[PDB]
Design a protein around this ligand. Structure first.
Ligand SMILES: [Zn+2]
Ligand SMILES: [Zn+2]
Ligand SMILES: [Zn+2]
Lengths: 45, 75, 184, 124, 101, 92, 68, 49, 74, 186, 107, 119
RNA sequence: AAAAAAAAAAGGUAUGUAUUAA
RNA sequence: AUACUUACCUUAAGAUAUCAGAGGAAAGUCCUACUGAUCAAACAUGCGCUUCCAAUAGUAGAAGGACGUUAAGCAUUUAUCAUUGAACUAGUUCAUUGAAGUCAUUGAUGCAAACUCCUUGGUCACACACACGGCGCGGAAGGCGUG
């Protein structure tokens, strides 16, 4: 029971609420992919 | 070897005592493994607060060897 | 290197400030260590001093002066009795440890500055620390701004009368039997 | 007073009450427990003794009685940089034989712990 | 080139070079040629002596040491001399060392 | 070494400091490193001449520390066990 | 963009003064060689604080600055 | 949601963490809607037979 | 974050003049143009003057040891 | 304690109670700002070098260094080793223990047992082809076998085959020993 | 790494001694982000040197601004964007089903 | 080469360890650590008297000397006698070793030869 | 006359979710 | 304890007494439960080896403490700086404005005593014995020596 986040390609359960997900959002993988998406948007302009 | 952990301190206005006598106050910018601390808008505190206090420069760096105690006056 | 945590007895490989900081803050390590110092602390009270005895030769004078004095009877409880009474005494000490009479906080509950002092979260000295003392709260109030304008009359069927002073369980038969006046 | 073993190093002596001299002219007296490569050591119950500036003139050359102001600080950890020299004050609460006894019993208990842990992990 | 890259023997050749060719060659040439050297410590008095040994940290073993120390109080000076046969000197106290002609 | 490990074991407890400048910082220890430089929380400060103040957060350099006073109940802490039995280390 | 070590490699066998940190004493002489710690060797040095000194070894910790 | 995650997390990453949290919640709602549509299609397929 | 020696490298290439305080025992402060530096924070100063603590004498291109450095101030 | 900002609960935190605040004692030492080692070090004087002569006339000749002679012994010994190697290097068309026929057909055997025999080596070397000449290296001071030999064969191809076969695998077993094999190398 | 003077000499040598790489005015590069995580592996091409970085970021103030670095930086980045999207597809294929619908067919 | 390895062969000799304080220690020498930590046995450690018509001696060394517990009350001059002093290495300034021992035998380091004999 | 391929995950700590009984 | 999810991270190097001689695989290395010397540790074991181990034939005493009292003991020395106005000698008092300002003055420094209380020891055995400075059983701490 989980939904894969498009950013980091990793799995996120809906029942773990937010405060656990913050650890996944502040990790190096997810934050890095967050930046790379934004960089793609930078380069599309 | 290990970097000192100032990570919560940076960008906060901080007072720190240079050697025995002196006390410098400035907004912490960066730091290194020797605790060399570079800060901006430095001011040298003295007995008379508005009077004898005189600013140093736009950017000042401090040798970690002369650092005694570092207090942040800030959140 | 490797960091051996001797409280948990479990190794952690290639010590680093991050992983070691995470382990030390960990809940399991927390319980293990706290319990460890609970035992090491209960021991010094548990351990009997057992100081050494030095027996000298009783003199001829005090043997004669102490012989005319009659021998006193000693009382010794049964094993089944002494186990229970030791349990009771220890549980009484644990009670006197946790008492900490707060009644002053109950007296001033409706004072105009009660929110700035006795709430202790919103104070100055201890106020800012409690925030960082809040647990990480992983998964699953009395604001300071109050004024006297709330609760203008402290008594409108609101308050409970002050709790009666306590009494020792042993000597509870010491109490004067009857009150002087008729309460409802 | 007390005779220390003619060859005894800082590792041989534990739990002896020591007398520690720093660069500033103050002394820390207490039981040593651990120490380190750079010789910063851990004292159990220790009291720092100090000769005031006013009593100091009494020590200059001419029975002297010095009033040595001292304060009690328990379980400290010194710094090797400050330490100057170390002297022995007393010998431990336990004799050598008794310490051999408690060492052997402690080791046996330690082995029993490893066995009770190994066989508690293995079957479950 | 930093020292942590080199092997165990490359440090030995490095120290051999530094002693043979380098600043401390002033002391080395002084040890072989039996030339007396003057040494100023940071304690502010000066030994005239002859170097039987020396080392990386500059600590050195000496023979026929002559120590010269003066003291003054309120501009009242006295010169004191103290003779020693053999000595071992820790190298952190020294500042300047000269080789006499 | 054990002396530094005992300082790491004192985190979150009230400790005292003596800096080689002569001051005294007594308060609660938040962080400590293997370089002995510590940072303390809600600390009372005594200047070398006795003037006492209060500051919420402090960071001190370990080289300037002289002695550190640690809660006494850490004396019997497991670091001081002479004969101790560790299991085998995991293979990595 | 000269750094310290090439600056000492460029000052070899040139007349250099060196100010120690204590008495404001400076040794004026022809540099001979330097170590990795910037130990100094000097020829025909003169002590200014007035004298003439044949050969000198200067340990690294006591020097304040080096000039030409 | 802000008071719960604000304590432990640094304040500078609190904003981007909050936006990522809201985005995740929206994605969860979308997945729920898709599941509901699939359920409706299954009901229609059961009614046709 | 701006590491301190990065900031010093910004003193080298930006050619800004700097005043630098020494240890409290010596009693002089140096000022000049920081050219280059080493890992030990010992720096070469071009066109440096030593001021006692404005009649100070000009020094030169001078290598100054990092052991005596207290502040480097623009 | 009241707050106890800690991992531990209230009962464990109140168990760690510190000793009471340290009483204040006025410092008996020099303030950190005043701390310095002795300044105004008198440099080495022309007057000091003038006082040198009293020391020089008293101890004109230094004691000899006998700990350096231990090193000057070993280094000179190394130079003499190099000289003996020089005596050997000047000494294969003269040697005529080595003057046997063309070196292309000369195959070198080594690590042979000192108790070995010419017949067995004639068989093991004869396995790879016909034998032209054979010579066994013995010391000049006495007849003890050095453990090496040179075998000239009728064709160089058979000598190479013997080097590869016999020498390329484990060494060729002869008597109780494994014998290495190669070309003449000289 | 053993002493602070060695690490600091390494950092100063990074400060003071085509190479392209890091490019865009904000941080990035594909590699530098994921070090220590399972995803990215070790040495990466060319050299992200603080000297070149300071030169380029100062040329941002100079404003010469020729986004050839960005035109290489799309060829670098968008490939990783597509890799992540692909991994998403693989995970979506993996997760949803199993032996699964067997029992569901049973239902 | 580490010249401290010389001091480790001076064991069981009468020596004076003259420290940075000016304090001088006469005693029988025991094992010297690689950091030059010097441990002695039967020691008389004192301070010299600068005469110069009463020039105040080291004020810190007098306190550190009385605080060893070894200074006896009736000593007229400033001295102390005690057993087992352990001295940190960085405190040592000079070491005056006896006149009898020969340096040529003790100054030969076995590692220095071992490096040359092996090459 | 000559010829041709490679063998592999590791395992530590922490957090959340589920299971181990009248 | 098991399963899944997420986060944080991964190997400074080398060595285990020295010296010398003989042997095995001209130079060097490695090796010999090989031979000698020296060193170190553990374990035993000895010395007419050294020091210490408290009254009961009495209400004691030795060592070490009090972060104990007398005790506001006795004898000393101390309580912020700057600006403006009034008076004033030729510095002093009062009022206003600003800055910082450990608490204490029953303090702090020096001097000394009395009292009270805590911890510790073989409170062992034989002996109340006119000598020229021993040779009871143990325990503690050392030094030296042999194996
Ligand atoms: Zn995600
Ligand atoms: Zn743990
Ligand atoms: Zn890159």
């Amino acid at each position: 029971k989980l939904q894969v986040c498009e950013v980091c390609g990793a799995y996120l359960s809906r029942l773990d609420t937010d405060r656990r997900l913050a650890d996944h959002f502040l990790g190096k993988i997810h934050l890095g992919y967050v930046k790379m998406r934004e960089d793609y948007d930078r380069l599309m302009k | 070897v290990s970097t000192p952990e100032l990570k919560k301190y940076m960008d906060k206005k901080i007072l720190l005592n240079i050697n025995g006598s002196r006390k410098v106050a400035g907004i912490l910018r960066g730091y290194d493994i020797f605790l060399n601390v570079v800060l901006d808008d430095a001011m040298e505190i003295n007995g008379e607060d508005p009077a004898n206090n005189h600013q140093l420069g736009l950017q000042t760096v401090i040798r970690g060897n002369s650092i005694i105690s570092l207090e942040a006056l800030d959140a | 290197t490797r960091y051996y945590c001797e409280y948990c007895h479990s190794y952690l490989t290639h010590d680093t400030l991050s992983v070691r900081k995470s382990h030390l803050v960990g809940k399991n390590h927390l319980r293990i260590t706290a319990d460890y110092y609970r035992n090491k602390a209960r021991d010094i009270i548990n351990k009997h001093n057992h100081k050494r005895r030095h027996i000298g030769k009783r003199g001829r004078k005090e043997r004669e002066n102490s012989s005319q004095n009659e021998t006193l009877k000693v009382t010794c409880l049964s094993n089944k009795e002494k186990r229970h009474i030791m349990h009771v005494k220890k549980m009484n000490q644990k009670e006197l440890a946790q008492t900490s009479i707060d009644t002053l906080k109950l007296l001033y509950d409706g004072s105009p500055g009660y929110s700035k002092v006795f709430v202790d979260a919103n104070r100055f000295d201890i106020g800012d620390l409690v925030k960082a003392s809040k647990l990480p709260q992983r998964a699953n109030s009395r604001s300071r701004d109050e004024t006297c304008e709330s609760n203008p009359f402290p008594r409108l069927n609101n308050p409970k009368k002050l709790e009666p002073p306590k009494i020792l369980s042993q000597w509870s038969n010491t109490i004067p039997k009857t009150s002087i006046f008729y309460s409802v | 007073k007390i005779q220390v073993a003619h060859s005894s190093r800082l590792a041989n002596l534990i739990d002896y009450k020591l007398r520690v001299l720093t660069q500033d002219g103050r002394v820390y007296i207490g039981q040593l427990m651990a120490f380190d490569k750079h010789m910063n050591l851990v004292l159990n119950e220790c009291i720092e003794e100090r000769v005031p500036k006013t009593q100091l003139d009494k020590l200059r050359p001419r029975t002297l009685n010095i009033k040595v102001e001292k304060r009690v600080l328990g379980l400290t950890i010194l710094r090797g940089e400050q330490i100057l020299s170390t002297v022995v004050e007393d010998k431990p609460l336990l004799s050598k034989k008794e310490r051999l006894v408690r060492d052997k019993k402690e080791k046996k208990q330690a082995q029993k712990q490893t066995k009770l842990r190994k066989e508690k992990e293995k079957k479950p | 080139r930093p020292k942590h890259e080199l092997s165990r023997a490359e440090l030995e050749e490095l120290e051999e070079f530094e002693f043979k060719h380098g600043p401390m060659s002033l002391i080395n040439d002084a040890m072989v040629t039996r030339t007396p050297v003057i040494i100023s410590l940071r304690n502010n008095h000066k030994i005239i002596a002859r170097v039987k040994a020396f080392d990386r940290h500059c600590n050195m073993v000496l023979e026929n040491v002559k120590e010269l120390w003066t003291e003054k109080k309120g501009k009242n000076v006295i010169n004191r001399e103290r003779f020693i046969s053999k000595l071992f000197l820790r190298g952190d106290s020294v500042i300047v060392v000269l080789k006499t002609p | 070494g054990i002396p530094v490990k005992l300082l790491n074991e004192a985190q979150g407890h009230i400790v005292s400091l003596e800096l080689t400048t002569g001051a005294t910082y007594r308060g609660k220890l938040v962080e400590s490193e293997d370089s002995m430089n510590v940072q303390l929380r809600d600390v009372i400060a005594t200047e070398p001449q006795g003037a006492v103040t209060h500051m919420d957060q402090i960071f001190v350099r370990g080289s300037q520390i002289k002695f550190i006073v640690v809660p006494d109940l850490l004396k019997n802490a497991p670091l001081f066990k002479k004969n101790s039995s560790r299991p085998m280390p995991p293979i990595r | 963009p000269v750094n310290p070590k090439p600056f000492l490699k460029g000052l070899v066998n040139h007349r250099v003064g060196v100010k120690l940190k204590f008495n404001s004493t400076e040794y004026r002489g022809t540099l001979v060689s330097t170590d990795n710690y910037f130990n100094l060797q000097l020829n025909e040095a003169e002590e200014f604080v007035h004298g003439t000194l044949g050969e000198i070894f200067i340990r690294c910790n006591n020097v304040l600055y080096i000039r030409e | 949601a802000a008071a719960a995650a604000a304590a432990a997390a640094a304040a500078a990453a609190a904003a981007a963490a909050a936006a990522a949290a809201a985005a995740a919640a929206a994605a969860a709602a979308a997945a729920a809607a898709a599941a509901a549509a699939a359920a409706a299609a299954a009901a229609a397929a059961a009614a046709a037979a | 974050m701006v590491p301190p020696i990065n900031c010093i490298f910004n003193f080298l290439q930006q050619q800004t003049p700097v005043t630098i305080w020494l240890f409290e025992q010596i009693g002089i402060r140096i000022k000049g143009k920081i050219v280059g530096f080493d890992e030990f924070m010992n720096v070469v100063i071009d066109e440096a003057v030593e001021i006692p603590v404005e009649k100070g004498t000009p020094l030169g291109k001078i290598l100054l040891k990092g052991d005596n450095i207290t502040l480097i101030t623009s | 304690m009241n707050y106890n900002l800690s991992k531990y609960p209230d009962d464990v935190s109140r168990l760690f109670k510190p000793r009471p605040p340290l009483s204040y004692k006025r410092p008996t030492d020099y303030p950190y700002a005043k701390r310095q080692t002795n300044p105004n070090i008198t440099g080495v004087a022309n007057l000091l070098s003038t006082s040198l002569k009293h020391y020089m006339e008293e101890f004109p000749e230094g004691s000899p260094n006998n700990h350096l002679q231990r090193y000057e012994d070993i280094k000179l010994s190394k130079i003499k080793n190099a000289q003996l190697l020089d005596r050997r290097l000047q000494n294969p068309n003269v040697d005529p223990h080595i003057k046997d026929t063309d070196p292309y057909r000369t195959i070198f055997i080594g690590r042979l047992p000192y108790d070995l025999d010419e017949i067995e080596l004639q068989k093991y070397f004869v396995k790879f082809g016909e034998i032209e000449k054979i010579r066994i290296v013995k010391d000049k001071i006495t007849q003890k076998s050095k453990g090496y030999a040179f075998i000239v064969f009728k064709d160089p191809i058979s000598s190479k085959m013997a080097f590869k076969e016999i020498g390329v695998h484990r060494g060729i077993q002869i008597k109780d020993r494994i014998c290495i094999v190669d070309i003449e190398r000289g | 790494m053993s002493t602070p003077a060695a690490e600091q000499r390494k950092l100063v040598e990074q400060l003071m001694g085509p190479k392209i790489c890091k490019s865009y005015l904000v941080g990035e590069c594909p590699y530098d982000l994921f070090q220590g995580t399972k995803q990215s592996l070790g040495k990466c091409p060319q050299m992200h040197l603080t000297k070149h970085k300071i030169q380029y970021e100062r040329e941002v103030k100079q404003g010469k601004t020729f986004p050839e670095f960005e035109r290489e930086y799309l060829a670098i980045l968008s490939r990783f964007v597509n890799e992540c999207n692909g991994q998403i597809s693989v995970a979506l294929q993996n997760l949803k089903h199993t032996a699964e619908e067997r029992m569901k067919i049973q239902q | 080469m580490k010249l401290v390895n010389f001091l480790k062969k001076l064991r069981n000799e009468q020596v004076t360890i003259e420290l940075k304080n000016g304090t001088t220690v006469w005693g029988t020498l025991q094992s010297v650590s690689p950091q030059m930590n010097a441990i002695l046995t039967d020691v008389k450690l004192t301070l010299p008297q600068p005469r110069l018509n009463k020039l105040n001696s080291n004020g810190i060394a007098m306190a550190s000397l009385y605080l060893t517990g070894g200074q006896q009350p009736t000593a007229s001059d400033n001295i102390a006698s005690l057993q087992y002093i352990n001295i940190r290495g960085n405190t040592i300034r000079q070491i005056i070793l006896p006149d009898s021992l020969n340096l040529d035998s003790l100054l030969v380091d076995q590692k220095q030869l071992n490096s040359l004999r092996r090459s």
